[PDB]
Each structure stands twice: as C-alpha cells, then as structure tokens.
Amino acid sequence: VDYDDGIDFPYDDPPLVCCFGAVQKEFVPVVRVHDNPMHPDIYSQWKMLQWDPPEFGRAPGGPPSNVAISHVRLGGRAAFMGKVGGDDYGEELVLMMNKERVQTRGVKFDEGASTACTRVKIKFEDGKMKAETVKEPPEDSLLASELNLAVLKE
Amino acid sequence: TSTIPGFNQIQFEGFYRFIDQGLIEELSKFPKIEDIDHEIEFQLFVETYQLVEPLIKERDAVYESLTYSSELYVS
C-alpha cells in the first residue's frame, strides 16, 4: 500500500505543517479549579485574572487551528486537517482559516451536521445530573477515509 | 480597581456619604431647647429623619427656575 502524488518538484521553501483535529473560534480546553473568583457577573474585573492568572492558565493553549494560524503568521505554512459543518459557522471557520492563509485541503465539509453543535442526552444517575453524547460534532467525527494524503505527504 | 472610575463618581460617592451619614451626624448635634422659665422643652427626634423625594422633576425645576430638592422631615 502506497500513495503517489505524481509530482516531483520540491514542494515549497517553508515546509508544511499539518494541524489535525478541531477548529473553534476560540476555546480553552485546559480548565481546572481556581482559588480566586472575581465577581460572578461583572466581566469588567476578569482582567485581574488575566494578569494574575491561575498557573495552569498562565499560557493557555487552544484548538490546533490557533496553532495553524499562528504558525502561518510567524511565516511558516500550515494545513489544517479536520471537519466542519455545511452550516454558516463552518463556512465562517473555513473563511477564518483561508483569510489567515491556512491551507484547507484536508478540511472536509459534513453536510448533515451543525459544526460546533454536539447532541447530548441529559441523564440523572446517583441523583446527579449527567450528560452522554448522542451525536458527536463534525470536528469530532472526521473519518480515516477523509484524510488528505497529499497534505500528510507534504 | 479593574477599570477607569466613573469621572463623576467622586461627586456621587461624596453626595451619597452626605445622605448616608451627614444627615444623622448633623441632626444628632441638634440640642434640646429650653425656655427662659425652665418649664418647656423642645427636641428633634433625629431617628425619624425622612427625605421625601422632590415633588418637581429636574427638567421642570430648570424650566421654572427652581431648586431641585428633597424635603427633610423630622418628628
């Protein structure tokens, strides 16, 4: 088993990076309990928690699309490999990628799902409320047959 | 702390302090008043101090050339 592009030119000078996974406009995965809440409603004071922040939150990472954008803006080349919905927000995220000159040939476009929207069934167990995912979002549901092997080659 | 204060807040917090304590503070210094024959006596019961709202609104007071003012009553 092998894959051939039929091209022999040396690609291009800043070598490509492929960023695999999910795209969100901005989204912090790393969350933990912090000691100091500011006021629960006044967002005008949460600056105090971006200048004296939790230590896990001192330099948050985010979606790999953030890394793709930053890498391209730092002068490299990035391809984002992932899936988005056919809805307006998936278009907005692909447009964000394209305007940032992130290469989106591996970005698939599910037509029957709603980008960020995950279906979950709320359940009660041990008297606690719980959720279970009934349908995964597009960005969670890229198949191994939807990989762009030209990107993974480059 | 986190943000540029409201510029009028220095006035606002001053005036509210005047309402929140300066009325009690100054009315508390009102003495008992005694007549010349030492038989009749008058005092304000400062605990009953009551500012009723201005019966005339600002945009009417400015038009009629009046003072926009609350009325202090005491028993």
PDB file of C-alpha atoms in Angstrom:
ATOM      1  CA  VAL A   1       0.000   0.000   0.000  1.00  0.00           C
ATOM      2  CA  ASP A   2       1.361   3.390  -1.048  1.00  0.00           C
ATOM      3  CA  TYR A   3       0.176   6.769  -2.310  1.00  0.00           C
ATOM      4  CA  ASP A   4       1.763   8.687  -5.192  1.00  0.00           C
ATOM      5  CA  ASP A   5       1.149  12.362  -5.949  1.00  0.00           C
ATOM      6  CA  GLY A   6       2.664  12.228  -9.434  1.00  0.00           C
ATOM      7  CA  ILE A   7       4.704  15.374  -8.712  1.00  0.00           C
ATOM      8  CA  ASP A   8       8.466  15.718  -8.269  1.00  0.00           C
ATOM      9  CA  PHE A   9       9.010  19.425  -7.569  1.00  0.00           C
ATOM     10  CA  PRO A  10      10.430  20.069  -4.083  1.00  0.00           C
ATOM     11  CA  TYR A  11       7.164  21.447  -2.670  1.00  0.00           C
ATOM     12  CA  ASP A  12       7.974  24.858  -1.205  1.00  0.00           C
ATOM     13  CA  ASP A  13      10.583  26.509   0.932  1.00  0.00           C
ATOM     14  CA  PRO A  14       8.915  26.820   4.378  1.00  0.00           C
ATOM     15  CA  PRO A  15       7.984  23.184   4.994  1.00  0.00           C
ATOM     16  CA  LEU A  16       4.313  22.459   5.531  1.00  0.00           C
ATOM     17  CA  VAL A  17       2.848  21.675   8.936  1.00  0.00           C
ATOM     18  CA  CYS A  18      -0.430  19.773   9.225  1.00  0.00           C
ATOM     19  CA  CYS A  19      -2.584  20.580  12.262  1.00  0.00           C
ATOM     20  CA  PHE A  20      -5.105  17.826  12.972  1.00  0.00           C
ATOM     21  CA  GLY A  21      -8.279  17.989  14.990  1.00  0.00           C
ATOM     22  CA  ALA A  22     -10.935  20.575  15.769  1.00  0.00           C
ATOM     23  CA  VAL A  23     -11.463  24.232  14.913  1.00  0.00           C
ATOM     24  CA  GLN A  24     -13.197  26.683  17.241  1.00  0.00           C
ATOM     25  CA  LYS A  25     -13.191  30.467  17.108  1.00  0.00           C
ATOM     26  CA  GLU A  26     -11.508  30.467  20.496  1.00  0.00           C
ATOM     27  CA  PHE A  27     -11.780  27.792  23.143  1.00  0.00           C
ATOM     28  CA  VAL A  28      -9.745  26.834  26.232  1.00  0.00           C
ATOM     29  CA  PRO A  29      -9.618  23.051  26.800  1.00  0.00           C
ATOM     30  CA  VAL A  30      -7.377  23.178  29.884  1.00  0.00           C
ATOM     31  CA  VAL A  31      -9.712  24.069  32.757  1.00  0.00           C
ATOM     32  CA  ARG A  32      -9.183  23.376  36.466  1.00  0.00           C
ATOM     33  CA  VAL A  33     -10.486  24.807  39.729  1.00  0.00           C
ATOM     34  CA  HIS A  34      -9.026  28.204  40.630  1.00  0.00           C
ATOM     35  CA  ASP A  35      -8.805  29.751  44.085  1.00  0.00           C
ATOM     36  CA  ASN A  36      -9.862  33.335  43.293  1.00  0.00           C
ATOM     37  CA  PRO A  37     -13.204  34.072  41.650  1.00  0.00           C
ATOM     38  CA  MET A  38     -13.878  37.657  40.732  1.00  0.00           C
ATOM     39  CA  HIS A  39     -17.461  38.910  40.866  1.00  0.00           C
ATOM     40  CA  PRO A  40     -19.755  36.350  39.175  1.00  0.00           C
ATOM     41  CA  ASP A  41     -21.479  38.922  36.946  1.00  0.00           C
ATOM     42  CA  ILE A  42     -19.136  41.888  36.394  1.00  0.00           C
ATOM     43  CA  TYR A  43     -16.905  40.890  33.488  1.00  0.00           C
ATOM     44  CA  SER A  44     -15.114  44.223  33.958  1.00  0.00           C
ATOM     45  CA  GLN A  45     -12.918  42.659  36.654  1.00  0.00           C
ATOM     46  CA  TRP A  46     -11.750  39.494  34.951  1.00  0.00           C
ATOM     47  CA  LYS A  47      -8.760  41.348  33.639  1.00  0.00           C
ATOM     48  CA  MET A  48      -7.466  40.869  37.144  1.00  0.00           C
ATOM     49  CA  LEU A  49      -7.458  37.144  36.343  1.00  0.00           C
ATOM     50  CA  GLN A  50      -5.518  37.542  33.077  1.00  0.00           C
ATOM     51  CA  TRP A  51      -2.650  39.426  34.741  1.00  0.00           C
ATOM     52  CA  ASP A  52      -2.542  37.392  37.979  1.00  0.00           C
ATOM     53  CA  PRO A  53      -3.839  34.147  36.492  1.00  0.00           C
ATOM     54  CA  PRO A  54      -4.110  30.525  37.601  1.00  0.00           C
ATOM     55  CA  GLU A  55      -0.833  28.746  36.960  1.00  0.00           C
ATOM     56  CA  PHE A  56      -2.422  26.187  34.627  1.00  0.00           C
ATOM     57  CA  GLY A  57      -3.884  29.179  32.762  1.00  0.00           C
ATOM     58  CA  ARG A  58      -0.717  31.282  32.560  1.00  0.00           C
ATOM     59  CA  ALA A  59      -0.322  30.492  28.838  1.00  0.00           C
ATOM     60  CA  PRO A  60      -3.427  28.645  27.631  1.00  0.00           C
ATOM     61  CA  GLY A  61      -3.300  26.533  24.545  1.00  0.00           C
ATOM     62  CA  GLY A  62      -6.323  26.148  22.338  1.00  0.00           C
ATOM     63  CA  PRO A  63      -7.559  24.451  19.192  1.00  0.00           C
ATOM     64  CA  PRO A  64      -4.900  23.307  16.719  1.00  0.00           C
ATOM     65  CA  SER A  65      -6.387  25.816  14.271  1.00  0.00           C
ATOM     66  CA  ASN A  66      -4.992  28.509  16.567  1.00  0.00           C
ATOM     67  CA  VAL A  67      -1.582  26.893  16.151  1.00  0.00           C
ATOM     68  CA  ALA A  68      -2.042  26.743  12.375  1.00  0.00           C
ATOM     69  CA  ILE A  69      -2.921  30.443  12.196  1.00  0.00           C
ATOM     70  CA  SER A  70      -0.059  31.444  14.485  1.00  0.00           C
ATOM     71  CA  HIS A  71       2.447  29.296  12.578  1.00  0.00           C
ATOM     72  CA  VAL A  72       1.387  30.776   9.233  1.00  0.00           C
ATOM     73  CA  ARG A  73       1.538  34.292  10.673  1.00  0.00           C
ATOM     74  CA  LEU A  74       5.007  33.524  12.059  1.00  0.00           C
ATOM     75  CA  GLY A  75       5.900  32.908   8.411  1.00  0.00           C
ATOM     76  CA  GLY A  76       5.570  29.143   8.132  1.00  0.00           C
ATOM     77  CA  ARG A  77       2.979  27.190   6.197  1.00  0.00           C
ATOM     78  CA  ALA A  78       0.151  25.278   7.859  1.00  0.00           C
ATOM     79  CA  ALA A  79      -2.559  22.982   6.602  1.00  0.00           C
ATOM     80  CA  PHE A  80      -5.500  22.375   8.924  1.00  0.00           C
ATOM     81  CA  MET A  81      -6.898  18.839   8.700  1.00  0.00           C
ATOM     82  CA  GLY A  82     -10.354  18.437  10.166  1.00  0.00           C
ATOM     83  CA  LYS A  83     -14.071  18.568   9.511  1.00  0.00           C
ATOM     84  CA  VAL A  84     -16.688  21.317   9.728  1.00  0.00           C
ATOM     85  CA  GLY A  85     -20.401  21.548   9.160  1.00  0.00           C
ATOM     86  CA  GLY A  86     -22.010  22.774   5.985  1.00  0.00           C
ATOM     87  CA  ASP A  87     -23.741  25.460   8.041  1.00  0.00           C
ATOM     88  CA  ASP A  88     -22.837  29.149   8.176  1.00  0.00           C
ATOM     89  CA  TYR A  89     -20.450  28.709  11.113  1.00  0.00           C
ATOM     90  CA  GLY A  90     -18.376  26.014   9.420  1.00  0.00           C
ATOM     91  CA  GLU A  91     -18.094  28.408   6.489  1.00  0.00           C
ATOM     92  CA  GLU A  92     -17.054  31.175   8.893  1.00  0.00           C
ATOM     93  CA  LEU A  93     -14.339  28.942  10.365  1.00  0.00           C
ATOM     94  CA  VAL A  94     -13.028  27.906   6.946  1.00  0.00           C
ATOM     95  CA  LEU A  95     -13.074  31.564   5.893  1.00  0.00           C
ATOM     96  CA  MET A  96     -11.080  32.419   9.024  1.00  0.00           C
ATOM     97  CA  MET A  97      -8.573  29.728   8.009  1.00  0.00           C
ATOM     98  CA  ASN A  98      -8.373  30.945   4.397  1.00  0.00           C
ATOM     99  CA  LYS A  99      -8.048  34.625   5.322  1.00  0.00           C
ATOM    100  CA  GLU A 100      -5.179  33.599   7.599  1.00  0.00           C
ATOM    101  CA  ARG A 101      -3.716  31.722   4.587  1.00  0.00           C
ATOM    102  CA  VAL A 102      -4.017  28.364   6.334  1.00  0.00           C
ATOM    103  CA  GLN A 103      -4.277  25.698   3.636  1.00  0.00           C
ATOM    104  CA  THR A 104      -7.636  23.958   3.871  1.00  0.00           C
ATOM    105  CA  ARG A 105      -7.499  20.991   1.501  1.00  0.00           C
ATOM    106  CA  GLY A 106      -7.976  18.487   4.324  1.00  0.00           C
ATOM    107  CA  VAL A 107     -10.898  20.383   5.798  1.00  0.00           C
ATOM    108  CA  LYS A 108     -13.892  18.224   4.929  1.00  0.00           C
ATOM    109  CA  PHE A 109     -17.435  19.599   4.909  1.00  0.00           C
ATOM    110  CA  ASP A 110     -20.098  17.429   6.511  1.00  0.00           C
ATOM    111  CA  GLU A 111     -23.477  18.486   5.160  1.00  0.00           C
ATOM    112  CA  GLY A 112     -25.674  16.752   7.745  1.00  0.00           C
ATOM    113  CA  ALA A 113     -24.269  18.177  10.977  1.00  0.00           C
ATOM    114  CA  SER A 114     -24.084  21.536  12.665  1.00  0.00           C
ATOM    115  CA  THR A 115     -20.385  22.330  13.258  1.00  0.00           C
ATOM    116  CA  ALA A 116     -19.968  23.170  16.967  1.00  0.00           C
ATOM    117  CA  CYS A 117     -23.300  21.569  17.920  1.00  0.00           C
ATOM    118  CA  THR A 118     -22.968  18.280  19.815  1.00  0.00           C
ATOM    119  CA  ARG A 119     -26.079  16.251  20.594  1.00  0.00           C
ATOM    120  CA  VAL A 120     -26.143  15.084  24.224  1.00  0.00           C
ATOM    121  CA  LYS A 121     -28.775  13.296  26.303  1.00  0.00           C
ATOM    122  CA  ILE A 122     -29.088  14.694  29.821  1.00  0.00           C
ATOM    123  CA  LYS A 123     -29.480  11.880  32.349  1.00  0.00           C
ATOM    124  CA  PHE A 124     -29.729  11.507  36.116  1.00  0.00           C
ATOM    125  CA  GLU A 125     -27.540   8.979  37.938  1.00  0.00           C
ATOM    126  CA  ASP A 126     -26.742   8.800  41.663  1.00  0.00           C
ATOM    127  CA  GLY A 127     -29.121  11.776  41.810  1.00  0.00           C
ATOM    128  CA  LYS A 128     -26.515  13.851  39.969  1.00  0.00           C
ATOM    129  CA  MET A 129     -27.200  15.281  36.536  1.00  0.00           C
ATOM    130  CA  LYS A 130     -25.038  13.779  33.799  1.00  0.00           C
ATOM    131  CA  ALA A 131     -24.727  14.055  30.036  1.00  0.00           C
ATOM    132  CA  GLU A 132     -23.852  11.497  27.387  1.00  0.00           C
ATOM    133  CA  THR A 133     -23.084  12.359  23.779  1.00  0.00           C
ATOM    134  CA  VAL A 134     -25.813  11.216  21.397  1.00  0.00           C
ATOM    135  CA  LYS A 135     -24.074  12.640  18.330  1.00  0.00           C
ATOM    136  CA  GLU A 136     -20.524  13.938  18.011  1.00  0.00           C
ATOM    137  CA  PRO A 137     -19.887  17.250  16.245  1.00  0.00           C
ATOM    138  CA  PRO A 138     -18.337  17.362  12.755  1.00  0.00           C
ATOM    139  CA  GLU A 139     -14.928  18.300  14.159  1.00  0.00           C
ATOM    140  CA  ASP A 140     -15.080  15.186  16.361  1.00  0.00           C
ATOM    141  CA  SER A 141     -16.169  12.910  13.508  1.00  0.00           C
ATOM    142  CA  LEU A 142     -13.533  13.061  10.772  1.00  0.00           C
ATOM    143  CA  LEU A 143     -13.064   9.579   9.324  1.00  0.00           C
ATOM    144  CA  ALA A 144      -9.772   7.906   8.448  1.00  0.00           C
ATOM    145  CA  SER A 145     -11.009   7.776   4.836  1.00  0.00           C
ATOM    146  CA  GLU A 146     -11.325  11.581   4.754  1.00  0.00           C
ATOM    147  CA  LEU A 147      -7.642  12.312   5.394  1.00  0.00           C
ATOM    148  CA  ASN A 148      -5.900  14.285   2.646  1.00  0.00           C
ATOM    149  CA  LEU A 149      -2.810  12.195   1.926  1.00  0.00           C
ATOM    150  CA  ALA A 150      -1.233  14.931  -0.206  1.00  0.00           C
ATOM    151  CA  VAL A 151      -1.139  17.100   2.918  1.00  0.00           C
ATOM    152  CA  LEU A 152       0.287  14.297   5.054  1.00  0.00           C
ATOM    153  CA  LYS A 153       2.871  13.713   2.330  1.00  0.00           C
ATOM    154  CA  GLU A 154       3.880  17.374   2.194  1.00  0.00           C
TER     155      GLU A 154
ATOM    156  CA  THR B   1      -9.632  48.909  40.653  1.00  0.00           C
ATOM    157  CA  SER B   2     -10.011  46.969  37.409  1.00  0.00           C
ATOM    158  CA  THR B   3     -11.190  49.895  35.279  1.00  0.00           C
ATOM    159  CA  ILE B   4     -11.169  53.681  34.915  1.00  0.00           C
ATOM    160  CA  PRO B   5     -13.641  55.010  37.511  1.00  0.00           C
ATOM    161  CA  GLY B   6     -16.685  56.977  36.517  1.00  0.00           C
ATOM    162  CA  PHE B   7     -15.496  60.572  36.442  1.00  0.00           C
ATOM    163  CA  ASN B   8     -18.497  61.861  38.404  1.00  0.00           C
ATOM    164  CA  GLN B   9     -18.151  59.055  40.963  1.00  0.00           C
ATOM    165  CA  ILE B  10     -16.092  61.284  43.260  1.00  0.00           C
ATOM    166  CA  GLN B  11     -19.081  63.599  43.446  1.00  0.00           C
ATOM    167  CA  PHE B  12     -21.562  60.717  43.562  1.00  0.00           C
ATOM    168  CA  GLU B  13     -19.873  58.867  46.401  1.00  0.00           C
ATOM    169  CA  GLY B  14     -19.486  62.157  48.216  1.00  0.00           C
ATOM    170  CA  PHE B  15     -23.171  63.012  47.957  1.00  0.00           C
ATOM    171  CA  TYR B  16     -24.248  59.534  48.978  1.00  0.00           C
ATOM    172  CA  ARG B  17     -21.987  59.784  52.004  1.00  0.00           C
ATOM    173  CA  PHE B  18     -23.679  63.066  52.877  1.00  0.00           C
ATOM    174  CA  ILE B  19     -27.018  61.289  52.695  1.00  0.00           C
ATOM    175  CA  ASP B  20     -25.760  58.086  54.304  1.00  0.00           C
ATOM    176  CA  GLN B  21     -24.288  59.779  57.367  1.00  0.00           C
ATOM    177  CA  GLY B  22     -24.028  63.574  57.237  1.00  0.00           C
ATOM    178  CA  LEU B  23     -27.739  63.966  57.914  1.00  0.00           C
ATOM    179  CA  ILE B  24     -27.630  61.755  61.009  1.00  0.00           C
ATOM    180  CA  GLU B  25     -24.353  63.334  62.108  1.00  0.00           C
ATOM    181  CA  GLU B  26     -25.601  66.915  61.881  1.00  0.00           C
ATOM    182  CA  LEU B  27     -29.123  66.284  63.211  1.00  0.00           C
ATOM    183  CA  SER B  28     -27.637  64.415  66.192  1.00  0.00           C
ATOM    184  CA  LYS B  29     -25.944  67.660  67.273  1.00  0.00           C
ATOM    185  CA  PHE B  30     -29.269  69.485  67.487  1.00  0.00           C
ATOM    186  CA  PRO B  31     -29.705  70.051  71.241  1.00  0.00           C
ATOM    187  CA  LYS B  32     -32.693  70.033  73.490  1.00  0.00           C
ATOM    188  CA  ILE B  33     -34.025  73.598  73.596  1.00  0.00           C
ATOM    189  CA  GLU B  34     -35.187  75.033  76.919  1.00  0.00           C
ATOM    190  CA  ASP B  35     -37.344  78.075  77.584  1.00  0.00           C
ATOM    191  CA  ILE B  36     -36.339  81.044  79.735  1.00  0.00           C
ATOM    192  CA  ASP B  37     -38.516  79.841  82.637  1.00  0.00           C
ATOM    193  CA  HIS B  38     -37.093  76.271  82.580  1.00  0.00           C
ATOM    194  CA  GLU B  39     -40.529  74.682  82.137  1.00  0.00           C
ATOM    195  CA  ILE B  40     -40.983  73.938  78.398  1.00  0.00           C
ATOM    196  CA  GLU B  41     -38.712  71.767  76.274  1.00  0.00           C
ATOM    197  CA  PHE B  42     -38.306  71.022  72.559  1.00  0.00           C
ATOM    198  CA  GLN B  43     -36.221  68.421  70.735  1.00  0.00           C
ATOM    199  CA  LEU B  44     -35.937  66.818  67.316  1.00  0.00           C
ATOM    200  CA  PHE B  45     -36.198  63.013  67.306  1.00  0.00           C
ATOM    201  CA  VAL B  46     -33.422  62.570  64.729  1.00  0.00           C
ATOM    202  CA  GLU B  47     -34.316  58.873  64.372  1.00  0.00           C
ATOM    203  CA  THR B  48     -37.390  59.966  62.367  1.00  0.00           C
ATOM    204  CA  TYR B  49     -35.447  61.875  59.682  1.00  0.00           C
ATOM    205  CA  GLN B  50     -37.266  61.381  56.367  1.00  0.00           C
ATOM    206  CA  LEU B  51     -36.276  62.749  52.958  1.00  0.00           C
ATOM    207  CA  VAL B  52     -39.312  62.781  50.699  1.00  0.00           C
ATOM    208  CA  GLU B  53     -38.412  62.861  47.003  1.00  0.00           C
ATOM    209  CA  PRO B  54     -38.602  66.107  45.012  1.00  0.00           C
ATOM    210  CA  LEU B  55     -42.206  66.680  44.006  1.00  0.00           C
ATOM    211  CA  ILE B  56     -40.825  68.596  40.988  1.00  0.00           C
ATOM    212  CA  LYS B  57     -38.640  66.792  38.453  1.00  0.00           C
ATOM    213  CA  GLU B  58     -35.314  68.185  37.244  1.00  0.00           C
ATOM    214  CA  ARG B  59     -36.495  69.247  33.785  1.00  0.00           C
ATOM    215  CA  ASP B  60     -39.364  71.142  35.412  1.00  0.00           C
ATOM    216  CA  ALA B  61     -37.192  72.781  38.084  1.00  0.00           C
ATOM    217  CA  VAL B  62     -34.724  74.035  35.464  1.00  0.00           C
ATOM    218  CA  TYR B  63     -37.585  75.406  33.348  1.00  0.00           C
ATOM    219  CA  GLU B  64     -39.464  77.082  36.225  1.00  0.00           C
ATOM    220  CA  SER B  65     -36.204  78.459  37.728  1.00  0.00           C
ATOM    221  CA  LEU B  66     -36.437  76.485  40.965  1.00  0.00           C
ATOM    222  CA  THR B  67     -34.185  74.323  43.132  1.00  0.00           C
ATOM    223  CA  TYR B  68     -34.429  70.566  42.598  1.00  0.00           C
ATOM    224  CA  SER B  69     -34.540  69.444  46.212  1.00  0.00           C
ATOM    225  CA  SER B  70     -35.722  66.729  48.581  1.00  0.00           C
ATOM    226  CA  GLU B  71     -37.680  67.656  51.696  1.00  0.00           C
ATOM    227  CA  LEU B  72     -36.385  66.680  55.145  1.00  0.00           C
ATOM    228  CA  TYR B  73     -38.990  65.989  57.837  1.00  0.00           C
ATOM    229  CA  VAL B  74     -38.351  65.037  61.468  1.00  0.00           C
ATOM    230  CA  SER B  75     -40.728  64.370  64.335  1.00  0.00           C
TER     231      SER B  75
END
